[PDB]
Structures are given as C-alpha cells and as structure tokens.
C-alpha cells in the first residue's frame, strides 16, 4: 500500500526525510496556532534556556518559527537544532530560539518528518559516485510529492520504495537503471521478485556502460 508523502530533505548518505500528506493540514493548523501564540508571547521577553534533548521553537531562514529539538550547545551564538517536522539541521544563535509551549508539543501532534533509506540499493562508497546518486535524487524528488511503501526494518532507518507521483516509476529502481547505485540483495522470499527486477536493471546498466559502469565492470 503506497501512501502519499512529501519528500523534504535528502542526506549526503542517501537517506531522506518525508512528511505524511494525510497529516499536512494538521501540521499547517498547528503551525498557524503556534505562530499566533508566539506573536503574543515574543521569545525576546520570554527567557527560554536551551539544553540538549530539549524541544524548542527555532526561527528558520524564511523568518518563520518552527518546532525543533536542541542537539548541541556549542556557544551562545551556535546552538545546533534539528527541525522535527522537516528533517533539516541548522546552527543558530539564541536570538532565534524560544520555548515550545505544551500546547504545540509532540504529544499534541507527532514530529512530522520521518527518516528513510531506499530498499534494495547500496549507498555508493566512493565519494564522487555517492554525490552523483544523491544529486540525482535531489533533482528528481526533493520537495515533491511521492508514493511510499515501507519494505523492511533495519539496524538503522526503515527501508522503503518510492514511486514518482505521475509516472508511478520506482525511484530507487531508476537509480539502478542509470547505473548510479548497486543492488543490495536480501534473503526474504517476498523480496525475490523485486530484487530480480533490480538485478536485471543493474545488468542492463552495466551493458549500457552507465555511470558506475562507464568503463566496464
């Protein structure tokens, strides 16, 4: 069952964050109400005190306040935050931090960004190859609605397949077809048909001498 998601951020190690489209209006409503509350209780007159693991509000580069979590306090001028509804990280001064009121907590609405990786593909170990794959994904899916299916859990993030909204083409499989990534095989019998399809695309990418396979194998 492929669910609609909005892809927000692509990491340098080929992970990505998504928002669930089904809860997008709930997030927007929370953000409108939180920002109305911030306007009546300006952080400048509030004296929040940032600490690691503590939630906060953080003012992003669009001049709007968002929900965040403090990850590291380097100095008063350098507080490292993670925007819990988007997945991006930022270093900011204390002038751009405030209290997250309980009315807008993750108990009221869960963190809206979830981190995933692509199922059935290996992240390239070579830096330039990895950059090529990340750049392809950023161009094709960053800040777009896609369809997502969770395939398997791992010792890290869950691994998923993504489809383009329009064509319904499998995004990860596209990378394999382009020779941008290698296939990661698994043993589960329910993945055998899809892994078979990915390996077939990989062999065709090798024959076409694309990207990873430009000079042969």
């Amino acid at each position: 069952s492929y669910k609609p998601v909005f892809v927000t951020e692509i990491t340098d190690d080929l992970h990505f964050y998504v928002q669930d489209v089904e809860t997008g209006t709930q997030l927007e409503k929370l953000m409108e109400n939180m920002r109305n509350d911030i306007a009546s209780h300006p952080p400048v007159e509030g004296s929040y005190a940032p600490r690691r693991g503590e939630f906060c509000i953080a003012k992003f580069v669009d001049g709007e306040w968002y929900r965040a979590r403090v990850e590291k306090v380097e100095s008063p001028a350098k507080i490292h935050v993670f925007y819990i509804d988007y997945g991006n990280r930022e270093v900011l001064p204390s002038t751009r931090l405030g209290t997250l009121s309980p009315a807008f907590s993750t108990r009221v609405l869960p963190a809206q960004a979830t981190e995933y990786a692509f199922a059935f593909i290996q992240v390239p170990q070579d830096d330039d190859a990895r950059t090529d794959a990340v750049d392809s994904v950023v161009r094709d899916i960053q800040n777009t609605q896609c369809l997502l299916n969770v395939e398997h859990l791992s010792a890290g993030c869950p691994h998923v397949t993504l489809q383009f909204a329009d064509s319904k083409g499998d995004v990860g499989l596209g990378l394999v077809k382009e020779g941008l990534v290698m296939v990661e095989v698994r043993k589960e019998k329910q993945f055998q048909k899809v892994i078979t399809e990915y390996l077939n695309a990989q062999e065709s990418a090798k024959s076409a001498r694309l990207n990873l396979w430009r000079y042969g194998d």
Binding site: T23, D62, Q145
Partner: peptide
C-alpha cells in the same frame, strides 16, 4: 511559503 506537503 516554505515547500511542504499540500494535504
């Protein structure tokens, strides 16, 4: 505004 889901 900021790119985000349009539910």
């Amino acid at each position: 505004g900021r790119a985000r889901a349009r539910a």
